[PDB]
Design a protein around this ligand. Structure first.
Ligand code: HEM
Ligand SMILES: OC[C@H]1O[C@H](O[C@H]2[C@H](O)[C@@H](O)[C@H](OCCCCCC3CCCCC3)O[C@@H]2CO)[C@H](O)[C@@H](O)[C@@H]1O
Ligand SMILES: CC1(C)[C@@H]2CC[C@@]1(C)[C@H](Br)C2
Length: 464
């Protein structure tokens, strides 16, 4: 009849005074102790429903996809995206952009590389770069971003950028800084009080700026493509979209607009780069802390692939330990602890509550990934979380780091291919070292908000 229960709010402040200063997720986890898996928190001016645990999350997104499939705003980036592009769209725009993006992130031109071949080539460029690093220390972020960006770059722009390209790296810096700022304490506070805080200086302005700087490139690239576009031979995702645009041009309301083109593209890049990159960063920090796991992966690589032949997607089936380690990396690293906000699209009953149209809903994917019934000792990194007693791969319906239902990560397929190929191709050719002994490696995230972001760290890649 009413909203889910939760702490009693104040006017203006919502439940500010009941929050935990360590952040939104920690706040919410404390509410769950008291209220259970379904509860309401007033984030500044508004109510927001939190759903926790895999059962409630799956009930909402899968059993009730007709109601829970809308997209809410992320206050730090809404003034940039404004409902354009597939991540932040709703209604028919979302339908159109989703169908477009899924198709063009899957099917490429006449005789163009598969996703797998694109990742395999990128991985060879990476291991050549690592060989040329001569075991030097580095923070591998730029490379992890490079390789993931370059996959999307091959689909969207028909090209890759060289790791030495300073303009490429500049754009990668902006993706890195932006995700951090968004995930910062200010960005979490901004989610509560954007109506107030937006009038002052702050990191919201820096994020807007960063995003515009990236978007400027995309605009320009769109202009260049429009200038050389061959309708008989589209080169890439941009041409394909330009084609649709030309086809629907007599419709003033076509969703194939220039703003959707720029911001959809930016969306794909942001989500395509920074997610997988961050996962690899955590992944290798975890390998430094648990060298026995990496040695064990290497054994499996040796025994299944050998030292020479490039890993291929077919290899997954035979490498349960390695797939387990990647599952566990993704589980532990908990990229988007609160997922991406949704919003009910119609009045919905949910577990005897009534959640009205337009209410924001956070699916707290972190609660599924740390569910102690599915994962013994969920706070620890342990690949056996994903193996049975025989050492066979043990998948579980709790593993929902890409979410579920209509808005499920559209890049799931690509990200899993990337994680598998990049991870195994690196481990096949290199072992890792660093100046920090494993016992001293601190896994505490540098930021934990919309994104969980690992600390910076130095690493060496030692040729085998
Ligand atoms: C480790 C990698 C990744 C993780 C953990 C991840 C996670 C997620 C999550 C949790 C969502 C929100 C789903 C929801 O709204 O309930 C999402 C959406 C999205 N992901 Fe990913 N993702 C990853 C990689 C990628 C990649 C590589 C791409 C592009 C190739 C991508 C493109 C997107 C897009 C476009 C959406 C918006 C989908 C929609 O609103 O319809 N993701 N992702
Ligand atoms: O379009 C307006 C802007 O154009 C210029 O900057 C260029 C830079 O001079 C030029 O060096 C830069 O190159 C970027 C190349 C690599 C981009 C790759 C990434 C872009 C999108 C996400 C994936 C990867 O692109 C910028 C934007 O087109 C001018 O320098 C700017 O002052 C101006 O604001
Ligand atoms: C996927 C994302 C681009 C990443 C996590 C949620 C996001 C929508 C915001 Br813009 C940062």
């Amino acid at each position: 009849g009413k909203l889910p229960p939760g702490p009693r709010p104040l006017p203006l402040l919502g439940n500010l005074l009941q929050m935990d200063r360590r952040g939104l997720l920690k706040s919410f986890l404390r509410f769950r102790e008291k209220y259970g898996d379904v509860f309401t928190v007033h984030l500044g001016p508004r109510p927001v429903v939190m759903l926790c645990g895999v059962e409630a999350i799956r009930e909402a997104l899968v059993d009730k996809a007709e109601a829970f499939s809308g997209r809410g705003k992320i206050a730090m980036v809404d003034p940039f995206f404004r409902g354009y592009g597939v991540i932040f769209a709703n209604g028919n725009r979302w339908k159109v952009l989703r169908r477009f993006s899924v198709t063009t992130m899957r099917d490429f031109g006449m005789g163009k590389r598969s996703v797998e071949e694109r990742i395999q080539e990128e991985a060879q460029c990476l291991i050549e770069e690592l060989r040329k690093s001569k075991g030097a220390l580095m923070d591998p972020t730029f490379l992890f971003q490079s390789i993931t960006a370059n996959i999307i770059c091959s689909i969207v722009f028909g090209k890759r950028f060289h790791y030495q390209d300073q303009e490429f790296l500049k754009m990668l810096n902006l993706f890195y800084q932006t995700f951090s700022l968004i995930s910062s304490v200010f960005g979490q506070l901004f989610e509560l009080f954007s109506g107030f805080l937006k009038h002052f200086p702050g990191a919201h302005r820096q994020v807007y700026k960063n995003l515009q700087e990236i978007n400027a490139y995309i605009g320009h690239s769109v202009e260049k493509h429009r200038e050389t576009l061959d309708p008989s031979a589209p080169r890439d995702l941009i041409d394909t979209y330009l084609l649709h645009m030309e086809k629907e041009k007599s419709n003033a309301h076509s969703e194939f607009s220039h703003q959707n083109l720029n911001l959809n593209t930016l969306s794909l890049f942001f989500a395509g780069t920074e997610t997988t990159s961050t996962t690899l960063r955590y992944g290798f920090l975890l390998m430094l802390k648990y060298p026995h796991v990496a040695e064990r992966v290497y054994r499996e690589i040796e025994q299944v692939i050998g030292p020479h032949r490039p890993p291929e997607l077919h290899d997954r089936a035979k490498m349960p330990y390695t797939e387990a380690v990647i599952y566990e990396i993704q589980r532990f690293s908990d990229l988007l602890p609160m997922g991406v906000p949704h919003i009910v699209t119609q009045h919905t009953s949910f577990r005897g509550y009534i959640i009205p149209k337009d209410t924001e809903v956070f699916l707290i994917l972190s609660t599924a990934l740390h569910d102690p019934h599915y994962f013994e000792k969920p706070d620890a990194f342990n690949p056996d979380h994903f193996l049975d007693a025989n050492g066979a791969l043990k998948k579980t319906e709790a593993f929902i780091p890409f979410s579920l239902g209509k808005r499920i990560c559209l890049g799931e397929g690509i990200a899993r291919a990337e994680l598998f190929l990049f991870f195994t191709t690196i481990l096949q050719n290199f072992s890792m070292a660093s100046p920090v002994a494993p016992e001293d490696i601190d896994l505490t995230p540098q930021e934990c908000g919309v994104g969980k972001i690992p600390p910076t760290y130095q690493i060496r890649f030692l040729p085998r």
